[PDB]
A paper describes a structure:
Interleukin 4 (IL-4) is a pleiotropic cytokine that plays a major regulatory role in the immune system. Signal transduction of IL-4 is mediated by a sequential binding process, initiated first by binding of IL-4 to its high-affinity single membrane spanning receptor chain IL-4Rα. This intermediate ligand receptor complex then recruits one of two possible low-affinity receptor subunits, the common gamma chain (γc) or the IL-13Rα1 chain, into the functional hetero-trimeric complex to initiate signalling. The overall structure of IL-4 comprises the known four-helical bundle in up-up-down-down topology, which like the crystal packing is unaffected by these mutations.
Residue numbers in the entry: 1 to 129
Write the structure that this text describes.
Amino acid sequence: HKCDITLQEIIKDLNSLTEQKTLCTELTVTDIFAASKNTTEKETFCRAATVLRQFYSHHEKDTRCLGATAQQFHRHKQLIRFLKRLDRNLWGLAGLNSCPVKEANQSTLENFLERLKTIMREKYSKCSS
């Protein structure tokens, strides 16, 4: 389970998500990476999945995000679709709903997703030769 291809599915969507630099991607999420980091792999997954579910739930219809042009709206819909898919994959790896997130610091979503991408690529690296 630890080195499952879900890791690739997550990294793919993080690569898609981090091309985006929009008003929406500068809105914030609770920075799970501001912890002095006392957490199992499964608990980190649960934490990331929680904050991202909060984000897409709160911003799927946010007028700062929805866009004026066709391209902006398309990019918003893509952002939300990729966040939901990333989130489904993170939950599947968490095996866990019960991970209280208590950090104060807020990160932009862009910075949070880049950090998560680094973490996931590191896990991938530790799985492979």
